[PDB]
Design an enzyme around this catalytic site. Structure first.
Site, PDB file in Angstrom:
ATOM      1  N   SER A  90      12.765  21.126  17.662  1.00 28.32           N
ATOM      2  CA  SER A  90      12.313  22.482  17.593  1.00 28.32           C
ATOM      3  C   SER A  90      10.965  22.580  18.377  1.00 28.32           C
ATOM      4  O   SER A  90       9.976  22.037  17.915  1.00 28.32           O
ATOM      5  N   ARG A  91      11.082  23.161  19.574  1.00 28.89           N
ATOM      6  CA  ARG A  91      10.044  23.054  20.627  1.00 28.89           C
ATOM      7  C   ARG A  91       8.722  23.504  20.193  1.00 28.89           C
ATOM      8  O   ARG A  91       7.741  22.770  20.286  1.00 28.89           O
TER       9      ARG A  91
END
Lengths: 468, 71, 499, 50, 73, 187, 470
Positions: E9-10
């Site tokens: 999850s960037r």
């Protein structure tokens, strides 16, 4: 003949629109008067309404729509005879070498139809040379296609030169070295080298005639040079009954140029990024090469791989046409063996029991077998050590090493470098030598005393000279 | 508007110059664009499907596309 | 003030009446104005607009003749004059472009110095004959020891500098231009290579370092830099190698030599792609046009070493080709590789390993190579090929401890490899390349620790200049080693190794 | 210092727009008739010579 | 099917429960180190205590992770 | 025959009509009848709108032709064979385009030149005549082909004039000069 | 005469064709406006197809474009606002405020296009950026003039990287900045806007230290393309006329490449490089040249870049690699390992790294690091198969320092308080050079690996040696 005005100049694709009656036939040669010399355009479609679509042979620059065009009445006519030899000619049959107009008694078209069924190579034939390795393990044939492998300048030039030399003695024949994808710097060097080694003479006639197709001339001039040399060869075959040997350079750059010719004409270049009319073009090229009743053109062609692949379409189409492969390598050259031939990679589909008689095949199988067995043994013989050799095993080692040295020709083309008088060893005399070595009748003659000699006769001398 | 292969000035000049629009489009054709291994004959509208035509040149060919105005 | 200078220029501009053939844009899109008229017009001839844009005529067809625009699409509209200048694209050639950074058009963009011209020669010409040729045997020194011995350089001799992205491609090339300063300083003008660096589709920022570095080392008084930048359009980029070679032809024809370094043909191809696709030209390999081959081939066959008749001159070349991590199987690398004679292949690993240049000389071959090589360097580095060659294959054996034999080979190879690690932008004379390599070959350098190699190099050089600068000058000017110099050369290395 | 440098350029730019300002006066004045005709006759002299 | 190796999850996290962040605090490092150690583990090379520590810890977790169809909780 | 071939964009029809009636020397007659039938099509608003709009079947285009020939006198039967050939090919989409291209062919073959003398303003008849002469001196107009010229007012030239014909121009417009005058006062 | 009337002829997605009247004479790069309920749809003319008919790209919605509806001709490119009063406001792609505080203040306006500065204008770098991140600072530092590029895949913390640099560098320098958002999510804009409002980089009064230009991806492909040209123009104004350095930032510049690729096929320009615009080199080229140091200002851009499929030997990133001065490479693996940031040590490379420009000591130290890690990576193979005890003693020690170095890249950030929760650090350029050196010289191999994990500057490394012992 009929005259018309240029009505397009898109790319190197020029359409010419003619006064209404008829158009040129397909494959004909058209001549354009301009202050850029001439430009010879070849018709490869009829668009209808007295218009054409052409490919160019000479750069397309200094054209204007409205220049008057002339129809010759057929293909581009290249000179032929024995007054054209030792002189370099571009695709239109005129000098690059600037030694004054290349003209002869007769001219013949670059496109021709292949001979009848009856007049093809229908029975086996054998084309004798001077090299022991070629003549035993891969016999050159008449109307035979032998695809050369390896790089240029490690032996390649020496190999080409040799065979041109052998042919004059054998028949009285001629050769035409055709260079496709030729680099102009390299071309001068090949013509000067070819003079030195005695196969092109500055005074009158020669042996080989040179045909160069530069890269600074359109894709069509790379494509039609192969056809240009063929016409010369055929003239000797048909009307003077002499055998010829026709080289091609790289067959990658015949393929590379043909893709452009396809893509440009309207056609799609799909065949893994090359032309779909590739197979059919090789079919036209390599089915006019054959043994007629009066003579025969034989072809040596050169395979260049695209990225070390024998699974690509262009290598594949070539491998079907080819009847033998001769494989020069550098390893061989570094052990002081000239020809550079690999007897392990020397193979023909005209090496059989019924094609060269039984004896020739059966000696070749043994000669192949010794060297193969020596290699298998040698793997663990080096590792284990040279003293963990068997009595049996060292019998295979000994025979092989006698054969390895014996192959070498101190031949006339590479004579200067080793200093040793030239050799031509005929096919019958190659087979005969190999018979006495098989029965070990020269196991009194040392291994290294087979160095740089040819036939059976030749190694009598070296044996004495080593002892002396 | 639409572009058509029946915009050929040799065909067009003869249709216009009478009530006649050519009787060379029955059991005869006249060749137009030819080469690339595929040829285009104009007319032949009495023809059969997969028929043989013989050209006056000593070459014969097989109709593949029967199209309205060309074969 | 300034207005006065401008006032001077204004008066020099008058109303111009007579103009020749013309056309009017029918529709203009994507830099492809399509013109009505221009019936009779040369192939690829120049046109000048009424809004002052220039163009070339790749497409000639009777309905429309499809001009390709070089400049802006915002000054070109519908219904605008297109005057036919009546002159196919040609650019000025002279001696005056020495010390001059010019755009693709030949005018000064640095704003330094006028263009002294004598002729205008076409961007495209045709390559000379078979008779206008002579074998390649003239050396050229690049100042890197490895390149000059293992894969020598020659005159009218082209061979690649094909390598990976930002691994100091430009450093391999730059060293050579800087070395050509040596001949330039004297006065035999048949030894003077007047260098041309051709930045194609390569931005003005990158080039500003390129000019700056030249200026510091005083090398903008013979270097010429033809620039078609990343921002500048596809015609200019397409025509940048053709414009640069042509400048070189004036020098070459007058009997001189000159040298062209193309950077980079990976970017030349990209520009042809842009042009093809907008004119809907046939597809090819990798989505680049199929006819790219013909483009490269025409440019590379003019680079040649001419006969004595043509004054005994050449156009030497060194194309620089940009690879995507070392792919050479790629359609644009592959074309150039066959055409040219030789390659130099730089390697990413060597770079990471802190060896810069990262030139890898095992995977370098020159087809013509040593026929052009200094005699001196052939004697002391025949040996040098055979020593480094074994060490690669024997460096596929890695550490515990190994055979007595194998370990020895690594020691010898490694000292030589550190010797051939050099700082960049530092050229070398013939008199200082030849002594060092002899020390390696004869194992007076491979008896001394790795760490101390770098030290040894300068000390030995200084030691030779102090005692006997006579032997160095003798070596240089003879070009060769004689038995009397070879006796001496061993003697000298011994005293130096002692200290 | 930046703006002073900029100002020498601006001064020329003010003279650029000034050309436009005389242009307006030409098309309003009977320069619109007389100079168009100066233009016409020169075209007559050049074209007669062809 | 579930894989946590290529699951990222960037932007970064903040959307979970506060309690779940603590308990899984170093779970992310264990599983990521385990893959590398696991690959080495298959050659059959003798492994030192630092390597076998990671290998013993990682394996047990992975068995926790595994699930059967239709267990909402 | 044509004076020069023109191909594409429904001009292949015009070339064919021209050459067909040219080989029969009934070109004035073709022009007169074409002008007549076109003139009544253009000044009827929906008939000059919905006839270029090719929204008709096969059968309907044919029925169009029949209604058109009531407004035509039938002066020539070739431009009426043009209506029949268009209706059979399933189009009636461009009519003045086929017409206009034919118009160019007839009077160029005859020898009539079309020039333009764009100016910003009305000009002297002295000027027209002087220019007409300037042209005759030169090789654009040598006779064998007439001279006509049209002074136009376009504010697209805002002073000065441009002579045009046979794609050879003399351009003494003030606009282009105003643009170069800007360029140098922008350094 | 120029018509002020066009009637729309074909709406086929973003492509909108107009039928202008007699005498119009269309010209490319103009702006057509159509009155619509969603405002004024701007059309940037990108072809004329002949006979007064343009084929244009839309910058606003065409889900309500009515055919037959009047199209005015405005002419040239649109004009945004520039100044110093254009700072800390959120500016739309068509130039309009979506921050809703009356109009975006002006003095002067310039258009979204600009011609690229000539060779004579160009000048070199002389100032050295210091980011405060130990890996960037030793193994590839940036310099003002530069066209920095943050290459990485997805999940390597692209926004967070970009966020870090604003948290440090932006405050520090004396110049103003421009933040440009190309084709990004509605979450990310809001995250940037709140975080920097609080940090005072965004202020409701003008004359800030950033600008905001948010162009978003739920707007047509043409808008995403010309959000970038719009922000850039603010930076040129700074540079030349108002004579101030800019520390420009753009995000994600792949949305700019990907956008051109979408409208490329439809405009007729058949794809090249496989699925990409054939005008890739020149569009980049034009963009990059505007961002440079000249006779006044120095506009040093930090550009995010997205590598598709995590593979960087693909033609779209590779073309770009050339266009950018000071590349970095980031990857999924490093980020997951606990090493912040995911920048790789050998793959971070500058063309602005010289041995003299960054000083000899620095250069020598960063080279040693590049060697030790490279030996480590060669040794990985040996260690997998052979084992770790069949290594020489020199080798074993290099493994050991390389491990210390590998964990000496790890520094937590404030904007990665969504990962570790430990605030950021500022690390001075000299402090990086000296602490790496110490490891390599063998005098600072008394320090364990975990005491280089999660540290700042030098002072920190010492502090962590004590903490673990207790």
């Amino acid at each position: 003949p009929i005259t018309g005005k240029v009505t397009a100049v898109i790319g190197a694709i020029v359409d010419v629109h003619f006064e209404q009656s008829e158009l040129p036939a397909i494959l004909n040669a058209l001549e354009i008067k301009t202050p850029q010399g001439k430009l010879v355009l070849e018709v490869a479609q009829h668009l209808g309404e007295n218009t054409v679509r052409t490919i160019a042979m000479d750069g397309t620059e200094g054209l204007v729509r409205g220049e008057k065009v002339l129809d010759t009445g057929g293909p581009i006519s290249v000179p032929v005879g024995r007054e054209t030899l030792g002189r370099i000619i571009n695709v239109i049959g005129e000098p690059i070498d600037e030694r004054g107009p290349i003209k002869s008694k007769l001219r013949k078209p670059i496109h021709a139809d292949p001979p009848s069924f009856a007049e093809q190579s229908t029975s086996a034939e054998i084309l004798e040379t001077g090299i022991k390795v070629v003549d035993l393990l891969a016999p050159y044939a008449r109307g035979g296609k032998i695809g050369l492998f390896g790089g240029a300048g490690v032996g390649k030039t020496v190999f080409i030169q040799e065979l041109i030399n052998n042919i004059a003695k054998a028949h009285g024949g001629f050769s035409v070295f055709t260079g496709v994808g030729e680099r102009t710097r390299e071309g001068n060097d090949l013509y000067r080298e070819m003079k030195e080694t005695g196969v092109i003479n500055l005074e009158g006639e020669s042996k080989v005639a040179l045909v160069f197709g530069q890269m600074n001339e359109p894709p069509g001039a790379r494509a039609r040079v192969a056809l240009t040399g063929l016409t010369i060869a055929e003239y000797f075959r048909d009307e003077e009954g002499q055998d010829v040997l026709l080289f091609i350079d790289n067959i990658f750059r015949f393929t590379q140029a043909g893709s452009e010719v396809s893509a440009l004409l309207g056609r799609i270049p799909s065949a893994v990024g090359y032309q779909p009319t590739l197979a059919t073009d090789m079919g036209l090229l390599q089915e006019r090469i054959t043994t007629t009743k009066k003579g025969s053109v034989t072809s040596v062609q050169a395979v260049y791989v695209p990225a070390d692949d024998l699974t690509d379409p262009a290598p594949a189409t070539t491998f079907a046409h080819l009847d033998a492969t001769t494989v020069l390598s550098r390893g061989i050259s570094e052990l002081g063996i000239y020809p550079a031939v690999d007897p392990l990679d020397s193979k023909s589909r005209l090496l059989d029991a019924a094609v060269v008689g039984q004896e020739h095949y059966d000696v070749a199988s043994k000669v192949q077998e010794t060297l193969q067995t020596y290699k298998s043994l040698q793997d663990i013989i080096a590792i284990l050590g040279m003293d963990e050799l068997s009595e049996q095993d060292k019998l295979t080692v000994e025979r092989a090493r006698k054969i390895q040295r014996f192959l070498s020709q101190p031949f006339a083309v590479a004579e200067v470098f080793t200093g040793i008088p030239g050799k031509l060893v005929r096919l019958k005399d190659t087979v005969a030598s190999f018979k006495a070595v098989l029965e070990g009748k020269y196991d009194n003659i040392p291994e290294h005393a087979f160095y740089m000699v040819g036939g059976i006769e030749d190694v009598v001398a070296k044996a004495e000279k080593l002892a002396a | 508007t639409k572009a058509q292969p029946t915009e050929v000035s040799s065909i067009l000049e003869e249709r216009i110059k009478g009530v006649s629009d050519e009787a060379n489009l029955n059991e005869t054709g006249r060749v137009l664009a030819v080469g690339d291994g595929i040829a285009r004959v104009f007319g032949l509208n009495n023809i059969q499907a997969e028929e043989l035509v013989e050209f006056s040149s000593g070459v014969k060919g097989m109709a593949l596309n029967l199209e309205p105005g060309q074969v | 003030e300034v207005s006065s200078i401008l006032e001077e220029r204004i008066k020099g501009v008058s109303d111009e009446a007579n103009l020749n053939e013309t056309g009017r844009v029918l529709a203009v899109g994507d830099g492809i104005a399509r013109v009505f008229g221009l019936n009779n017009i040369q192939a690829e001839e120049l046109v000048e607009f009424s809004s002052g844009v220039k163009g070339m005529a790749l497409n000639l067809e009777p309905g429309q003749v499809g001009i390709v625009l070089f400049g802006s699409d915002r000054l070109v509209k519908e219904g605008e004059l297109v005057k036919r200048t009546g002159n196919i694209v040609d650019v000025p050639v002279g001696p005056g472009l020495l010390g001059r950074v010019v755009d693709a058009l030949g005018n000064p963009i640095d704003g330094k110095g006028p263009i002294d011209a004598a002729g205008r020669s076409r961007a495209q010409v045709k390559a000379p004959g078979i008779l206008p040729r002579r074998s390649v045997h003239e050396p050229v020194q690049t100042g890197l020891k490895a390149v000059d011995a293992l894969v020598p350089i020659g005159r009218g001799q082209r061979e690649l500098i094909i390598g990976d992205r930002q691994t100091g491609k430009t450093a391999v090339a730059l060293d050579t231009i800087l070395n050509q300063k040596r001949w330039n300083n004297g006065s035999d003008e048949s030894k003077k290579l007047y260098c041309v660096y051709v930045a194609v589709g390569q931005k003005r920022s990158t080039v500003a370092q390129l000019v700056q570095t030249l200026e510091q080392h005083d090398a903008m008084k013979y270097s010429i830099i033809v620039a078609a930048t990343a921002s500048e359009a596809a015609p200019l980029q397409y025509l940048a190698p053709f414009t640069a070679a042509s400048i070189g032809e004036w020098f070459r024809d007058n009997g001189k030599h000159a040298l062209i370094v193309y950077d980079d043909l990976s970017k030349q191809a990209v520009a042809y792609r842009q042009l093809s696709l907008l004119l809907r030209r046939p597809p090819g390999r990798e989505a680049y046009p199929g006819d790219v081959f013909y483009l490269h081939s025409r440019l590379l066959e003019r680079a040649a070493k001419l006969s004595e008749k043509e004054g005994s001159g050449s156009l030497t070349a060194l194309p620089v080709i940009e690879t995507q991590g070392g792919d050479v199987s790629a359609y644009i690398p592959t074309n150039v590789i066959s055409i040219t004679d030789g390659q130099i292949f730089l390697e990413a690993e060597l770079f990471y390993k802190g060896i810069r240049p990262a030139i890898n000389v095992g995977l370098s071959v020159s087809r013509v190579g040593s026929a052009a090589q200094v005699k001196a360097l052939k004697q002391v580095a025949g040996s040098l090929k055979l020593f480094l060659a074994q060490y690669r294959e024997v460096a596929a054996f890695a550490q515990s401890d190994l055979d007595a034999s194998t370990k020895q080979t690594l020691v010898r190879g490694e000292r030589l490899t550190q010797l051939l690690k050099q700082n960049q932008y530092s050229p070398l004379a013939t008199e200082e390349q030849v002594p060092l390599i002899y020390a390696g070959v004869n194992g007076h350098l491979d008896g001394i620790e790795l760490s101390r190699i770098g030290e040894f190099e300068s000390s030995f050089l200084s030691y030779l200049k102090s005692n006997h600068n006579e032997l160095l000058t003798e070596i240089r000017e003879k070009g060769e080693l004689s038995k009397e110099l070879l006796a001496s050369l061993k003697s000298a290395t011994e005293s130096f190794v002692a200290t | 210092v930046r703006y002073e440098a900029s100002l020498r350029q601006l001064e020329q730019r003010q003279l650029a727009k000034s050309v436009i300002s005389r242009v307006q006066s030409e098309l309003g004045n009977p320069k619109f008739q007389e100079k168009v005709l100066q233009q016409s006759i020169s075209e007559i002299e050049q074209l007669l010579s062809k | 099917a579930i894989n946590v190796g290529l699951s990222v999850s960037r932007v970064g996290s903040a959307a979970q429960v506060k309690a779940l962040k603590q308990v899984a605090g170093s779970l992310k490092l264990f599983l990521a180190q385990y893959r590398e150690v696991a690959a080495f583990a298959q050659f059959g090379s003798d492994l030192d205590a630092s390597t076998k520590q990671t290998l013993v810890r990682g394996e047990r977790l992975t068995q926790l992770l595994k699930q059967n169809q239709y267990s909402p909780l | 025959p044509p004076p020069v071939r023109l191909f594409g964009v429904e001009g292949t029809y015009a070339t064919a009509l021209y050459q067909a009636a040219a080989k029969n020397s009934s070109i004035d007659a073709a022009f007169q009848s074409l002008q007549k039938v076109e003139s009544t099509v253009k000044k009827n608003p929906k008939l000059g709108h919905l006839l270029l709009n090719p929204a008709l079947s096969l059968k309907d285009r044919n029925s169009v032709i029949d209604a058109i020939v009531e407004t035509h006198k039938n002066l020539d039967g070739y431009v009426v064979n043009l209506l029949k050939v268009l209706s059979e090919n399933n189009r009636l989409g461009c009519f003045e385009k086929i017409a206009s291209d034919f118009g160019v062919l007839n009077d160029a073959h005859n020898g009539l030149l079309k020039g333009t003398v764009t100016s910003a303003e009305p000009l002297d008849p002295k000027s027209f005549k002087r220019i007409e002469k300037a042209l005759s001196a030169s090789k654009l107009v040598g006779q064998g082909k007439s001279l006509k010229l049209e002074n136009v007012v376009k504010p697209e030239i805002k002073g000065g004039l441009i002579v045009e014909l046979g794609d050879k121009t003399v351009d003494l417009s003030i606009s282009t000069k105003i643009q170069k005058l800007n360029k140098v006062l922008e350094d």
